[PDB]
């Protein structure tokens, strides 16, 4: 043999270092450890969107639970928050509902008032007041 | 496990020996030597390649033509079998044709 393999054990260790916490023969059999590590890395790479969707659904569920505990709903709250020229994502809303209940109750009251003003303007086809807390700000 | 535990001894080599320090001496003697002998004549080795490259089968043909009349029996048989195999592999099998 001429210039054969003299450092194969290092590659085996480099492959097995990612399989040091598995159950069965997958942490010792290299032939199966290769496939196990491949699938593990593929799933870890593809699960980013899954993690993002899970976090977003958890935030939505927390906001819905807080709105139901205060006395409102989730779609109406989101609509009244997007119709009041205030840009707050779901994370800060969940953080406030979990830690700062006073500002969340104030936001719920503002949302209820905006919804009532919108209903009044729809029933009156507005003409003159159109809501005190309304009046969009024009940015040129 | 195919890894040697103990480290090998340091293979020291004197880079200023005989053939190492005197490498390339008398090379290209035709140009600056009024052209007396060809530089290919300074190659020492098998007689069927002193100044000739060739292919794998061409070397075997040259060996059977020059030295083939003064070899053994088993060696000549093996050379003939190898020549037949190379012929069948080059003039029948392959690609780009």
């Amino acid at each position: 043999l001429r210039n054969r393999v003299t450092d194969r054990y290092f590659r085996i260790q480099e492959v097995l270092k990612h399989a040091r916490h598995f159950r069965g023969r997958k942490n010792r059999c290299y032939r199966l450890a290769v496939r196990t590590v491949i699938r593990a890395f593929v799933k870890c790479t593809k699960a980013r969107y899954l993690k993002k969707k899970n976090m977003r659904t958890l935030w939505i569920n927390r906001i819905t639970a807080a709105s139901q505990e205060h006395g409102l709903k989730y779609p109406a709250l989101i609509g009244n928050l997007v119709k009041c020229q205030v840009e707050l994502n779901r994370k800060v809303l969940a953080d406030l509902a979990i830690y700062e209940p006073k500002t969340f109750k104030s936001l719920a009251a503002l949302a209820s008032r905006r919804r009532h003003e919108g209903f009044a303007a729809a029933l009156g086809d507005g003409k003159e007041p159109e809501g005190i807390f309304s009046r969009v700000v024009q940015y040129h | 496990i195919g890894i040697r535990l103990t480290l090998p001894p340091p293979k020291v080599v004197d880079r200023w020996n005989e053939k190492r320090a005197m490498f390339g001496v008398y090379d290209n003697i035709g140009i600056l030597g009024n052209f007396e002998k060809h530089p290919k004549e300074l190659i020492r080795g098998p007689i069927w390649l002193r100044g000739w490259k060739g292919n794998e089968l061409q070397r075997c043909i040259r060996k059977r033509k020059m030295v083939g009349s003064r070899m053994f029996a088993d060696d000549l048989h093996n050379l003939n079998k190898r020549i037949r195999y190379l012929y069948k592999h080059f003039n029948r099998h392959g690609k780009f044709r």
Binding site: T6 | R4, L5, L7
Partner: peptide, 26 residues
């Protein structure tokens, strides 16, 4: 035998690392 020295040196360094990791000196 397998001819080489660099892979053997890396393996010896790994052995020394494992030795100093298993037996921590003061």
């Amino acid at each position: 035998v397998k001819k080489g020295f660099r892979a053997a040196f890396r393996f010896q360094k790994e052995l020394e690392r494992q030795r100093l990791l298993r037996c921590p000196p003061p």
